[PDB]
Every structure is written in C-alpha cells, then in structure tokens.
C-alpha cells in the first residue's frame, strides 16, 4: 500500500484586516488514502461550523480537500488547522501565520 | 488560453458495511461544475456552477444515469481487483479514474486521456494516440485484454475526440462570463529577517484566474531557482487562486534579487522590489 | 458530459 503524507496550508481567503469578516482556509493535499480528519481551531478549540470541497485528486492520484469557514480576525485570537491521517502517527497542527 | 474538461472518480471500499463510498466530480479548467456523492440524499448528479443549471432534465437524467453506471462499475472492480491481488476482505481499497480532453486557444482538440488507478497507483491508462493501452503490471495486463476485446479504446476515442470536445465548447460558451475571464494576480512583497544578517523575501500572487502561473526570483537577472522556496497553487475558496515564492537573502544585497511574474491576465509581466 | 460507460469492468 502506497500511502502519502498530507501537506497542509492554513491561510485566509483575502488579505486579513483585524475586525472585518473573512474566510480561513485549511487546504490539505498530496495525501493517500482518502480518509482524513480536519479540524479548524480557534484558540485551541474546534469550530463547529466548517464546510469542505468535494474530494478530488491530482495528476499523481494524491487527494486534496479544502476546509474553510468565515471568521473575524482580531489581533489576539489564535487560529490553526489540525489534521490527522493514517500517515501521521501524531496529529499535525499548523498555525495561521497571517503575516507570512 | 487553452481549456480542458476532466472527470475525476473515486471509490473507496468499506470492508464491513456494504456499498463503497463513491465521489465523482467534473471540471472545466479549474472550476468544478458537477458532482455526485453516494453519501448524499438526492442520488443525482448535482450542479456546482450557475452556467450548468440551465441544462434541462434530459441532461440531468442522462448524467445521473451514466454516473450511476460508473459507480456500479467501480464497485464490481473493487471485488475483482481484490481477487487479482488476492487481498483479504478486511482492508479498505481505492479505485480512481480520470478522463477528459484538452483544446487549444482556438478550442481545437489537442489531446485525450483516460487513466485508472488502484490503491493510489497507476493501474492502466489509454495511450496518447488513444488506440492502445498501457498496463502497469500483470493484473492490468488481464484488464487490457478484456478492454481490447470490448473495444473500450475505440469507444473512448470517439467520446474524447467528439462528444467531450463538443460539450466542452458548449460549456465554455454558456458560462463565458466566468470560464473565459482572466483575473490578474494582485501582487506584492513582504520582507523578514530571521536574525539580522539574512533576510526572507516572500513574493505573493493573489486573486488570480485561471490558475496557471509563473512566480520566480532571479539573481542579478540570472535565473536562481535552488535557494528558493515555493508553495503549490492553492484555491482562495472563492474561485480564484493564490501562490507565493520566497528566497533567503543576506541583508544588504536584495537589489540584485527581483520577483518575476507571468500570467494570462497581465498585459505585461510584473517585476518586484523592496 | 460523462462518457457512456457500458460493460467496462476491469
């Protein structure tokens, strides 16, 4: 069984400005098999309302999904994406570094 | 620019509870326009773009009909393939199928493709000229004979060279506001020094469509693509795309490193500096 | 438009 580790990107739909509604994306790709758990985190807690794209896949057969949710970026609030998958022995959390 | 139509199919066996999970999605270029999910309640092909929602019931009956049959086929392949490799029925296994067509700027047929994968690796593919199959291993080789005997390649070729191309043009026309747009990247730069003797320059491309792009750093105008750090083009989640490239640069020398941007939506390629 | 797949089992 060839299995592939997901690469994870957390970013916001537009350039973020404290105070105004927006959308936060967790884009996971390059993974195999397809079962994957994605939680978007607000201050270490898990947001209840989160939709995803329709499972699809790249030229190399590895899958990719987009998990997104509107949020309002204050200046203090911490945002991250947590992903577990069969190739990850330990959940991976990637932090939303706005000023990347 | 050039265009394409692609169908992507995935079927995942569930060892213990019957029916496989099956997800089918159709794309024109980077824009998803139809979907089927065997877990959803409608059990029909559903629209995902406005310019497909005008197609009548004949379309939706046909598209549900043919997407059901794709489902049933993969569901029987799952069992077959398990036999071919002699796997137990306790594991979960995946078949994926991808096919479609490409046209040029004059919407003229450029090429067809149709490939099939088992557990995330090539199983069997239609060759470039669309008359012959390439088989990954012994199992595929037996599938090659089946499909040669059923003239599957002949059916696909007629599909890919006519039907596929013809409906792509219809889609391209019906949805021309959106499918035929170019949005230029709104670009920009951000600077950052880790300590205070080397610096990281990130060059951003945002809100662009279509998704193809070139984002590169050059040294002294000479192409330096090894000390660079790029990400894959991601979806902004609204139908446009994002990408950035970054370089490490010894503080005080940035002026001979510039950003190079090409994209369909720009009248001329952009350059950047800090 | 999907391919009209008929008896295309592996």
Automatic annotation (TrEMBL), chain C:
Entry's family note: Belongs to the hepacivirus polyprotein family.
Subcellular localization, as worded in the UniProt entry: Host cell membrane; Host cytoplasm, Host perinuclear region; Host endoplasmic reticulum membrane; Host lipid droplet
Record organism: Hepacivirus hominis
Domain of life assignment: Viruses
Name listed for the protein in its UniProt record: Genome polyprotein
Subunit field text: Homodimer. Interacts with host SPCS1; this interaction is essential for viral particle assembly. Interacts with envelope glycoprotein E1. Interacts with envelope glycoprotein E2. Interacts with viroporin p7. Interacts with serine protease/helicase NS3. Part of the replication complex composed of NS2, NS3, NS4A, NS4B, NS5A and the RNA-directed RNA polymerase embedded in an ER-derived membranous web. Part of the viral assembly initiation complex composed of NS2, E1, E2, NS3, NS4A, NS5A and the mature core protein.
Function noted in UniProt: Induces a specific membrane alteration that serves as a scaffold for the virus replication complex. This membrane alteration gives rise to the so-called ER-derived membranous web that contains the replication complex. NS4B self-interaction contributes to its function in membranous web formation. Promotes host TRIF protein degradation in a CASP8-dependent manner thereby inhibiting host TLR3-mediated interferon signaling. Disrupts the interaction between STING and TBK1 contributing to the inhibition of interferon signaling.
């Amino acid at each position: 069984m060839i299995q592939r580790t997901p690469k994870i990107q957390v970013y916001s739909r537009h350039p973020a400005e404290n105070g105004k509604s927006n959308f936060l994306n967790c884009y996971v790709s390059g993974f195999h098999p397809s079962d994957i758990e994605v939680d978007l985190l607000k201050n270490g807690e898990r947001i209840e309302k989160v939709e995803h794209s329709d499972l699809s896949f790249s030229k190399d057969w590895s899958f990719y999904l987009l998990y997104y949710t509107e949020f309002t970026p204050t200046e203090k609030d911490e945002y991250a994406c947590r992903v577990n998958h069969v190739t990850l022995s330990q959940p991976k959390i990637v932090k939303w570094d706005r000023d990347m | 620019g050039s265009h394409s139509m692609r169908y992507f199919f995935t079927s995942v066996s569930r060892p213990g509870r019957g029916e496989p999970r099956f997800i089918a999605v159709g794309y024109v270029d980077d824009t998803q326009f139809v979907r089927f999910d065997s877990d959803a309640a409608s059990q029909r092909m559903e629209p995902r773009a406005p310019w497909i929602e005008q197609e009548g019931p004949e379309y939706w009956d046909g598209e549900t009909r043919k997407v059901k049959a794709h489902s049933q086929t993969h569901r029987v392949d799952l069992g077959t393939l398990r036999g071919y490799y002699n796997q137990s029925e306790a594991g979960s296994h995946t078949v994926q199928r991808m096919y479609g067509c490409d046209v040029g700027s004059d919407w003229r047929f450029l090429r067809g493709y149709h490939q099939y994968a088992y557990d995330g690796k090539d199983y069997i593919a239609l060759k470039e000229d669309l008359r012959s199959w390439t088989a990954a291993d012994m199992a595929a080789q037996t599938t090659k004979h089946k499909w040669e005997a059923a003239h599957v390649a002949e059916q696909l070729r007629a599909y890919l060279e006519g039907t596929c191309v013809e409906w792509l043009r219809r889609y391209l026309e019906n949805g021309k506001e959106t499918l035929q747009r170019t949005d230029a990247p709104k670009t920009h730069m951000t600077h950052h020094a880790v300590s205070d003797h080397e610096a990281t320059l990130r060059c951003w491309a945002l809100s662009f469509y279509p998704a193809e792009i070139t984002l590169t750093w050059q040294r002294d105008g000479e192409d330096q693509t090894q000390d660079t750090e790029l990400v894959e083009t991601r979806p902004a989640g609204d139908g446009t795309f994002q990408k950035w490239v970054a370089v490490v640069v010894p503080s005080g020398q940035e002026q001979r490193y510039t950003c190079h941007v090409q994209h369909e939506g720009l009248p001329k390629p952009l350059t950047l500096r800090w | 438009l999907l391919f009209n797949i008929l008896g295309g089992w592996v």
